[PDB]
Amino acid sequence: VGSEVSDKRTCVSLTTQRLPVSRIKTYTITEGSLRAVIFITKRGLKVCADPQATWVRDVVRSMDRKSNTRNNMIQTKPTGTQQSTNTAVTLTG
């Protein structure tokens, strides 16, 4: 139950899995050697896709709208550590 890691970078391959935008959350397109479109799903699963795909470009257009303001609508704020009080309870014996 799992795949190979340490080798990959961001995803596995380029596309090969026409994911429904409805399931996709946000995306990230690169311009560097990568020059690939990254698709992030609500499941936190991010994949890569070729921007040469028309369907992709079409979804990319919507993706922006799908996550136009949403991006802001979501601002996961992580935490460091927490505090607590001391305890004291002994068991008979």
Cβ pair 33, 74 in contact under 8 A:
no
Nearest Cα to Cα of residue 49 among 21, 2, 90, 17: 17
**What CATH number is given to the structural domain containing 57?**
2.40.50.40
Tell me how far apart the alpha carbons of residues 58 and 63 are, in angstroms, rounded to a whole number.
9
Q: Residue 37: what are its φ and ψ, rounded to 5°?
A: -95, 125
Give the other-Cβ count within 10 Å of 30's Cβ. 13
The residue segments making up the domain with residue 87 are: 1-93
User: If you ran DSSP here, which 8-state letter would residue 26 be given?
Assistant: E
Cβ pair 39, 46 in contact under 8 A:
yes
AA identity, residue 6: S
Experimental technique = NMR
3-state DSSP assignment of residue 25: strand
Q: 38: part of which helix (H) or strand (E)?
A: strand 37-41
The count of domains in the chain is 1
AA identity, residue 77: K
